[PDB]
Write an enzyme that holds these catalytic residues in place. Structure first.
Site, PDB file in Angstrom:
ATOM      1  N   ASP A  46       0.834  -1.199   0.000  1.00 22.72           N
ATOM      2  CA  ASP A  46       0.000   0.000   0.000  1.00 22.72           C
ATOM      3  C   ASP A  46       0.867   1.247   0.000  1.00 22.72           C
ATOM      4  O   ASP A  46       1.700   1.449   0.901  1.00 22.72           O
ATOM      5  CB  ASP A  46      -0.929   0.033   1.207  1.00 22.72           C
ATOM      6  CG  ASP A  46      -1.849   1.239   1.185  1.00 22.72           C
ATOM      7  OD1 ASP A  46      -2.870   1.200   0.446  1.00 22.72           O
ATOM      8  OD2 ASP A  46      -1.549   2.221   1.909  1.00 22.72           O
ATOM      9  N   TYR A  51       2.806  10.049   0.796  1.00 20.81           N
ATOM     10  CA  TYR A  51       3.750   9.455   1.758  1.00 20.81           C
ATOM     11  C   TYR A  51       5.197   9.780   1.385  1.00 20.81           C
ATOM     12  O   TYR A  51       6.117   9.587   2.181  1.00 20.81           O
ATOM     13  CB  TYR A  51       3.591   7.927   1.869  1.00 20.81           C
ATOM     14  CG  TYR A  51       2.193   7.449   2.229  1.00 20.81           C
ATOM     15  CD1 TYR A  51       1.241   8.320   2.746  1.00 20.81           C
ATOM     16  CD2 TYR A  51       1.822   6.123   2.044  1.00 20.81           C
ATOM     17  CE1 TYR A  51      -0.052   7.884   3.065  1.00 20.81           C
ATOM     18  CE2 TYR A  51       0.538   5.677   2.363  1.00 20.81           C
ATOM     19  CZ  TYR A  51      -0.400   6.561   2.871  1.00 20.81           C
ATOM     20  OH  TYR A  51      -1.679   6.122   3.187  1.00 20.81           O
ATOM     21  N   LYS A  80      -2.518   6.065  -4.519  1.00 18.48           N
ATOM     22  CA  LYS A  80      -3.665   6.911  -4.252  1.00 18.48           C
ATOM     23  C   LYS A  80      -3.518   8.316  -4.831  1.00 18.48           C
ATOM     24  O   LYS A  80      -2.413   8.869  -4.905  1.00 18.48           O
ATOM     25  CB  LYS A  80      -3.926   7.006  -2.742  1.00 18.48           C
ATOM     26  CG  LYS A  80      -3.723   5.683  -1.960  1.00 18.48           C
ATOM     27  CD  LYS A  80      -4.318   5.756  -0.562  1.00 18.48           C
ATOM     28  CE  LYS A  80      -3.997   4.509   0.258  1.00 18.48           C
ATOM     29  NZ  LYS A  80      -2.568   4.468   0.661  1.00 18.48           N
ATOM     30  N   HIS A 113      -7.735   9.073  -2.497  1.00 18.04           N
ATOM     31  CA  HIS A 113      -7.209   9.055  -1.132  1.00 18.04           C
ATOM     32  C   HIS A 113      -8.180   9.592  -0.092  1.00 18.04           C
ATOM     33  O   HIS A 113      -8.340   8.999   0.979  1.00 18.04           O
ATOM     34  CB  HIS A 113      -5.890   9.835  -1.071  1.00 18.04           C
ATOM     35  CG  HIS A 113      -4.987   9.396   0.038  1.00 18.04           C
ATOM     36  ND1 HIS A 113      -3.611   9.391  -0.079  1.00 18.04           N
ATOM     37  CD2 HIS A 113      -5.264   8.938   1.282  1.00 18.04           C
ATOM     38  CE1 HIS A 113      -3.079   8.951   1.049  1.00 18.04           C
ATOM     39  NE2 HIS A 113      -4.060   8.665   1.890  1.00 18.04           N
TER      40      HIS A 113
HETATM   41  N1  NAP Z   1      -6.243   7.567   4.477  1.00 16.30           N
HETATM   42  C1  NAP Z   1      -5.632   6.430   4.162  1.00 16.30           C
HETATM   43  O1  NAP Z   1      -5.903   5.786   3.106  1.00 16.30           O
HETATM   44  C2  NAP Z   1      -4.644   5.854   5.155  1.00 16.30           C
HETATM   45  C3  NAP Z   1      -4.473   6.402   6.419  1.00 16.30           C
HETATM   46  C4  NAP Z   1      -3.647   5.784   7.346  1.00 16.30           C
HETATM   47  C5  NAP Z   1      -2.986   4.626   7.011  1.00 16.30           C
HETATM   48  N2  NAP Z   1      -3.118   4.102   5.778  1.00 16.30           N
HETATM   49  C6  NAP Z   1      -2.330   2.889   5.283  1.00 16.30           C
HETATM   50  O2  NAP Z   1      -2.372   1.858   6.273  1.00 16.30           O
HETATM   51  C7  NAP Z   1      -1.045   1.622   6.800  1.00 16.30           C
HETATM   52  C8  NAP Z   1      -1.140   1.213   8.253  1.00 16.30           C
HETATM   53  O3  NAP Z   1      -1.669   2.307   9.025  1.00 16.30           O
HETATM   54  P1  NAP Z   1      -0.698   3.169   9.955  1.00 16.30           P
HETATM   55  O4  NAP Z   1       0.612   3.238   9.283  1.00 16.30           O
HETATM   56  O5  NAP Z   1      -1.375   4.430  10.341  1.00 16.30           O
HETATM   57  O6  NAP Z   1      -0.557   2.201  11.219  1.00 16.30           O
HETATM   58  P2  NAP Z   1      -0.435   0.775  11.792  1.00 16.30           P
HETATM   59  O7  NAP Z   1      -0.112  -0.295  10.816  1.00 16.30           O
HETATM   60  O8  NAP Z   1      -1.726   0.512  12.616  1.00 16.30           O
HETATM   61  O9  NAP Z   1       0.708   0.848  12.949  1.00 16.30           O
HETATM   62  C9  NAP Z   1       2.081   1.095  12.579  1.00 16.30           C
HETATM   63  C10 NAP Z   1       2.930   1.143  13.825  1.00 16.30           C
HETATM   64  O10 NAP Z   1       2.868  -0.131  14.509  1.00 16.30           O
HETATM   65  C11 NAP Z   1       4.169  -0.631  14.729  1.00 16.30           C
HETATM   66  N3  NAP Z   1       4.156  -2.078  14.547  1.00 16.30           N
HETATM   67  C12 NAP Z   1       4.087  -2.755  13.362  1.00 16.30           C
HETATM   68  N4  NAP Z   1       4.067  -4.063  13.485  1.00 16.30           N
HETATM   69  C13 NAP Z   1       4.139  -4.254  14.866  1.00 16.30           C
HETATM   70  C14 NAP Z   1       4.177  -5.421  15.653  1.00 16.30           C
HETATM   71  N5  NAP Z   1       4.102  -6.657  15.147  1.00 16.30           N
HETATM   72  N6  NAP Z   1       4.299  -5.266  16.995  1.00 16.30           N
HETATM   73  C15 NAP Z   1       4.377  -4.029  17.496  1.00 16.30           C
HETATM   74  N7  NAP Z   1       4.332  -2.859  16.850  1.00 16.30           N
HETATM   75  C16 NAP Z   1       4.204  -3.041  15.522  1.00 16.30           C
HETATM   76  C17 NAP Z   1       5.066   0.058  13.714  1.00 16.30           C
HETATM   77  O11 NAP Z   1       6.424   0.163  14.193  1.00 16.30           O
HETATM   78  P3  NAP Z   1       7.728   0.093  13.199  1.00 16.30           P
HETATM   79  O12 NAP Z   1       7.492   0.646  11.727  1.00 16.30           O
HETATM   80  O13 NAP Z   1       8.747   0.953  14.068  1.00 16.30           O
HETATM   81  O14 NAP Z   1       8.062  -1.455  13.266  1.00 16.30           O
HETATM   82  C18 NAP Z   1       4.411   1.433  13.591  1.00 16.30           C
HETATM   83  O15 NAP Z   1       4.900   2.335  14.577  1.00 16.30           O
HETATM   84  C19 NAP Z   1      -0.295   2.918   6.517  1.00 16.30           C
HETATM   85  O16 NAP Z   1       1.114   2.771   6.501  1.00 16.30           O
HETATM   86  C20 NAP Z   1      -0.862   3.309   5.159  1.00 16.30           C
HETATM   87  O17 NAP Z   1      -0.300   2.496   4.134  1.00 16.30           O
HETATM   88  C21 NAP Z   1      -3.956   4.699   4.838  1.00 16.30           C
HETATM   89  O1  ZST Z   2      -3.497  10.337   4.283  1.00 17.70           O
HETATM   90  C1  ZST Z   2      -3.025   9.273   4.867  1.00 17.70           C
HETATM   91  O2  ZST Z   2      -2.897   8.193   4.301  1.00 17.70           O
HETATM   92  C2  ZST Z   2      -2.648   9.486   6.310  1.00 17.70           C
HETATM   93  C3  ZST Z   2      -2.670  10.933   6.750  1.00 17.70           C
HETATM   94  N1  ZST Z   2      -3.715  11.319   7.397  1.00 17.70           N
HETATM   95  N2  ZST Z   2      -3.773  12.598   7.891  1.00 17.70           N
HETATM   96  C4  ZST Z   2      -5.077  12.960   8.411  1.00 17.70           C
HETATM   97  C5  ZST Z   2      -5.912  13.451   7.255  1.00 17.70           C
HETATM   98  N3  ZST Z   2      -7.150  13.780   7.386  1.00 17.70           N
HETATM   99  C6  ZST Z   2      -7.672  14.222   6.166  1.00 17.70           C
HETATM  100  C7  ZST Z   2      -8.982  14.632   5.943  1.00 17.70           C
HETATM  101  C8  ZST Z   2      -9.386  15.007   4.665  1.00 17.70           C
HETATM  102  C9  ZST Z   2     -10.833  15.279   4.397  1.00 17.70           C
HETATM  103  F1  ZST Z   2     -11.306  14.543   3.354  1.00 17.70           F
HETATM  104  F2  ZST Z   2     -11.613  14.959   5.463  1.00 17.70           F
HETATM  105  F3  ZST Z   2     -11.060  16.574   4.111  1.00 17.70           F
HETATM  106  C10 ZST Z   2      -8.462  15.017   3.625  1.00 17.70           C
HETATM  107  C11 ZST Z   2      -7.151  14.619   3.826  1.00 17.70           C
HETATM  108  C12 ZST Z   2      -6.764  14.209   5.103  1.00 17.70           C
HETATM  109  S1  ZST Z   2      -5.225  13.622   5.660  1.00 17.70           S
HETATM  110  C13 ZST Z   2      -2.703  13.549   7.782  1.00 17.70           C
HETATM  111  O3  ZST Z   2      -2.786  14.663   8.260  1.00 17.70           O
HETATM  112  C14 ZST Z   2      -1.532  13.084   7.032  1.00 17.70           C
HETATM  113  C15 ZST Z   2      -0.449  13.941   6.842  1.00 17.70           C
HETATM  114  C16 ZST Z   2       0.640  13.525   6.096  1.00 17.70           C
HETATM  115  C17 ZST Z   2       0.662  12.261   5.539  1.00 17.70           C
HETATM  116  C18 ZST Z   2      -0.399  11.395   5.730  1.00 17.70           C
HETATM  117  C19 ZST Z   2      -1.499  11.790   6.485  1.00 17.70           C
END
Ligand code: NAP
Ligand code: ZST
Ligand code: NA
Length: 318
Positions: A46, A51, A80, A113
């Site tokens: 992903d 990012y 995204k 996104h």
């Molecule tokens: N709006 C969106 O579409 C959006 C928003 C947020 C996230 N995402 C996607 O989803 C992914 C995951 O979400 P997130 O990055 O917010 O968080 P996450 O996967 O819930 O948590 C990541 C954290 O957990 C730690 N961790 C990972 N595996 C672990 C394990 N087995 N035991 C203990 N700690 C562990 C990592 O540490 P280390 O890296 O130090 O090991 C890191 O600090 C993102 O990277 C991104 O690709 C998308």
């Molecule tokens: O984006 C990621 O994957 C993680 C992500 N989340 N957020 C919270 C967000 N809240 C939002 C709300 C809107 C909204 F649609 F609600 F206006 C639009 C955009 C965003 S970003 C951040 O502020 C952010 C900053 C840098 C890199 C990644 C992120």
């Protein structure tokens, strides 16, 4: 060697149910993270323009293909479209930079996104004199039309959405001249935010769900000490201890057993491997019902003051 189970999309393409998150993965560390993941058997990565590490992800993927550890056809790469690029010529450009950085000739899925469009310009989070988000002209509907062309040209296998409410998905699905449907909706999901109604809605429409921040995103900048913590939750650990697994592994398996795709992020090799070793145990129904009961409607990912703009998703019940 591990292999995540496949979830079938409405396009019949097969999306690996566990993928590698890359948000907050630092330059330097992310390339090795992707390599470790690939060697461990990850095929789903992903990614996102916003990012700002896609080029290092690109490096790693390219180097793995070249050394024949994996073939492109078996990788599943998701990226995204960031809200500041909704206007048609910008959609194509942002996609082109993402594709270039990733050293790919096609994406498996390209996601909107966030549903809310932002003002275009050399600025990722445009804001006013206060810290209020500045909205743009083009909507996610406009963006989608441009994205559909990417599919027409073979540059993207399928489209999807992220952070959409069902109202917003309804809007897209009833859009006139709709050519392609979203194959997934990537939203925050974990035991403090179980998304029961949104998952039900999506599945009823043939739209999969991708669970982000499944570990509670402890490394998110805006984390505050009083904020709940899934990984330290004693009830979670209690159930983990029973299966001789870690809390993280339970939090990942939770989604697998709801048929929900999940994308935990790590740059630690040991954890990356641990996070995909989740196909050798099962949670009981009682355990699942217990975990579901933890719902608190708490969003780790909700820091941006944007509720004034038209397409803010989290005002809706789901
Ligand atoms: N709006 C969106 O579409 C959006 C928003 C947020 C996230 N995402 C996607 O989803 C992914 C995951 O979400 P997130 O990055 O917010 O968080 P996450 O996967 O819930 O948590 C990541 C954290 O957990 C730690 N961790 C990972 N595996 C672990 C394990 N087995 N035991 C203990 N700690 C562990 C990592 O540490 P280390 O890296 O130090 O090991 C890191 O600090 C993102 O990277 C991104 O690709 C998308
Ligand atoms: O984006 C990621 O994957 C993680 C992500 N989340 N957020 C919270 C967000 N809240 C939002 C709300 C809107 C909204 F649609 F609600 F206006 C639009 C955009 C965003 S970003 C951040 O502020 C952010 C900053 C840098 C890199 C990644 C992120
Ligand atoms: Na979870």
């Amino acid at each position: 060697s591990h292999m995540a189970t496949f979830v079938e999309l409405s396009t019949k393409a097969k999306m690996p149910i566990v993928g590698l998150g890359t948000w907050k993965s630092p330059l330097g560390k992310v390339k090795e993270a992707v390599k470790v993941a690939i060697d461990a058997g990850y095929r789903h990565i992903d990614c996102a323009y916003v990012y700002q590490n896609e080029h290092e992800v690109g490096e790693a993927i390219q180097e793995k293909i070249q050394e024949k550890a994996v073939k492109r056809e078996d990788l599943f790469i998701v990226s995204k479209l960031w809200p500041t690029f909704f206007e048609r010529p910008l959609v194509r450009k942002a996609f082109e930079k993402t594709l270039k950085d990733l050293k790919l000739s096609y994406l498996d899925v390209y996601l909107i996104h966030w549903p809310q469009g932002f003002k275009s310009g050399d600025d990722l989070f445009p804001k006013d004199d206060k810290g209020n988000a500045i909205g743009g002209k083009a909507t996610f509907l406009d963006a989608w039309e441009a994205m559909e062309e990417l599919v027409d040209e073979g540059l993207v296998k399928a489209l999807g959405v992220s952070n959409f409410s069902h109202f917003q998905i309804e809007k897209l699905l009833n859009k006139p001249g709709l050519k392609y449907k979203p194959v997934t909706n990537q939203v925050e999901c974990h035991p403090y935010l179980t998304q029961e109604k949104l998952i039900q809605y999506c599945h009823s429409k043939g739209i999969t769900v991708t669970a982000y921040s499944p570990l509670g995103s402890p490394d998110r900048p805006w984390a505050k000490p009083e904020d709940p913590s899934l990984l330290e939750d004693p009830k979670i650990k209690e159930i983990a201890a029973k299966h001789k697994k870690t809390a993280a592994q339970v939090l990942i398996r939770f989604h697998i057993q709801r048929n929900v795709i999940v994308i935990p992020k790590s740059v630690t090799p040991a954890r990356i491997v641990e996070n995909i070793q989740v196909f050798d145990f099962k949670l009981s129904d009682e355990e699942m019902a217990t975990i579901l009961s933890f719902n608190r409607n708490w969003r780790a990912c909700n820091v941006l003051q944007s509720s004034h703009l038209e397409d803010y998703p989290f005002d809706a019940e789901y």
